[PDB]
Amino acid sequence: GSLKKIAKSLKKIAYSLKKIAQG
Amino acid sequence: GSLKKIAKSLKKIAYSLKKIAQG
Amino acid sequence: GSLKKIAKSLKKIAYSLKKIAQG
Amino acid sequence: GSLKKIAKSLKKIAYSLKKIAQ
Amino acid sequence: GSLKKIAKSLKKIAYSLKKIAQ
Amino acid sequence: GSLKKIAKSLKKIAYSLKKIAQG
Amino acid sequence: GSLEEIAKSLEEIAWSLEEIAQ
Amino acid sequence: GSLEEIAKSLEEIAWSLEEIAQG
Amino acid sequence: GSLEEIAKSLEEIAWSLEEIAQ
Amino acid sequence: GSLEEIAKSLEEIAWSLEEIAQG
Amino acid sequence: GSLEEIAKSLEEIAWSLEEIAQ
Amino acid sequence: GSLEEIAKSLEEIAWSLEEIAQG
C-alpha cells in the first residue's frame, strides 16, 4: 500500500536530516 | 494495506445490498 | 476529490437509514 | 480536494530538492 | 480526531448489524 | 489523532524552513 | 472538512441502526 | 486508487439503500 | 491504528450483511 | 480540517524550498 | 499503524530541521 | 491516485536528501 511506502520514505528522510543536522 | 481492505469490504457490502434491492 | 464524493454518498446513506428506522 | 493539493505541492518540493542536490 | 470517531461509529454499526443478523 | 500530529509537525517544519530561507 | 462530515454522517448511521436493531 | 474504488462502491451502496428504503 | 480498526469493522459488517441477504 | 492544514503547510514548504534553491 | 509511523517520522524531521534552522 | 503520486514524490525526495547528506 501507498501509506506503507510513504512511511518508509519518511524514515529515510528523517535519517538523512539527522545526519545533516549533526554535520 | 488498510485502504485496500476497506475497498474490498465495501465491494462486498455493495454486492450484498444490490442483491437485497433487486430481490 | 474522492473524500468529497464519499461524504456526499454517506449523507445519502444516512438519510435512507433514517427513513428505514423511522418508517 | 486536499490530497490533490498535497500531491502537487510534493512535486514542487521534489523538483526544488533535485535542484538543490545538483 | 476524525479517524478515531469514524472507527468508533463503525464499531457501533457492526454491533448493531450483528444483533440484526442474529 | 495521527492527522493532527502530522499537521502540527508540518507547521513546525514550514516555520523552520521559512527561517532557513530568510538568510 | 470532508473527514469530519464523514464522521458526522457515520454517527447518524450508527444511531439509525441502533434504532433498527433495538 | 483505493480511495476512488471506495467512492465508487459508496455511490452504489447509496443507490441500493435508497431503493430498499423506498420499498 | 484507526484505519486498521475501520478495516476490521467493515469486514464484520460485510459478513453480517451477507448473512442478512442470505 | 487537518488535511487542509497539511496542504497549506506543504505549499509554504514548497515556496521556502524554491527560495532556498534560488538563493 | 502506518499513519502513526508517519506522524512519528515527521516529528523527528521537525526536530532536526529546527536544529538546522538554529 | 493521489496517494500513489505522494508516495512516488516522497521516494524522489528521499533520494535527493540522501544525496545532499552524502555531499
Author numbering:
A (entry chain F), B (entry chain K), C (entry chain H), F (entry chain A), H (entry chain I), J (entry chain C), ...: 1 to 23
D (entry chain E), E (entry chain G), G (entry chain J), I (entry chain L), K (entry chain D): 1 to 22
Article sentences:
These designs are based on pairs of sequences with three heptad repeats (abcdefg), programmed with a = Leu, d = Ile, e = Ala, and g = Ser, and b = c = Glu to make the acidic (A) chains and b = c = Lys in the basic (B) chains.
Peptides starting at g (g-register) form a parallel 6-helix barrel in solution and in an X-ray crystal structure, whereas the b- and c-register peptides form an antiparallel complex. AUC showed that both CC-Hex2-AB-3-b and -g assemble into monodisperse hexamers. Concentration-dependent CD experiments confirmed A3:B3 stoichiometry, and both bound DPH with low μM affinities. CC-Hex2-AB-3-g showed reduced fluorescence when the substituted amino acids were positioned at the same terminus (N- + N-), suggesting an assembly with a parallel helix orientation. Moreover, at 5.6 Å, the Z-shift for the -g peptide is a whole α-helical turn (5.4 Å). Reasoning that larger Z-shifts lead to larger helical overhangs and less helix–helix contacts in the assembled CCs, it stands to reason that the antiparallel arrangement for the g-register peptide would be the least stable of these and less stable than the observed parallel structure. One of these, CC-Hex2-AB-3-g, has all-parallel helices, as is confirmed by solution-phase spectroscopic data and an X-ray peptide crystal structure.
